[PDB]
């Protein structure tokens, strides 16, 4: 007698997350997800909507400036697997020799 084994199914690492996201729809009562879901912090106008995101982006820019200004403080890698995107960026040329 022979037993037929089903063919394996392969999907992308994000497929399961994408399948679950399709089930949900936009919540009409809530403001866009990006904003803090709090009555005091929720934007209350088209101008606040823009300014609130710009303020948040400014905060992210300030942190990034500090992270790149002082890499020494953020060089202890404790993540497994390693996350390259969360490491400091070095923008200065490290080769000082005058050559092509």
């Amino acid at each position: 007698e022979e037993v037929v084994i089903p063919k394996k199914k392969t999907w992308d690492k994000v497929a399961v997350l994408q399948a679950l996201a399709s089930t949900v729809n936009r919540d009409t009562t809530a403001v866009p997800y990006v904003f803090q879901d709090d009555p005091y912090l929720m934007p209350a106008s088209s101008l606040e909507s823009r300014s609130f995101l710009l303020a948040k982006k400014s905060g992210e820019n300030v942190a990034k400036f500090i992270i790149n200004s002082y890499p020494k403080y953020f060089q202890k890698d404790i993540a497994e697997p390693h996350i390259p995107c969360l490491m400091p960026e070095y923008f200065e040329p490290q080769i000082k020799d005058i050559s092509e």
Binding site: R26, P32, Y33, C85
Partner: peptide
């Protein structure tokens, strides 16, 4: 476009390599 819901944020992190793959 901005992140629309919680699932989208999880997807972005997974693609960037920040969140663990399950």
């Amino acid at each position: 476009q901005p992140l629309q819901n919680g699932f989208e944020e999880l997807i972005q992190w997974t693609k960037e390599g920040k969140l663990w793959e399950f």
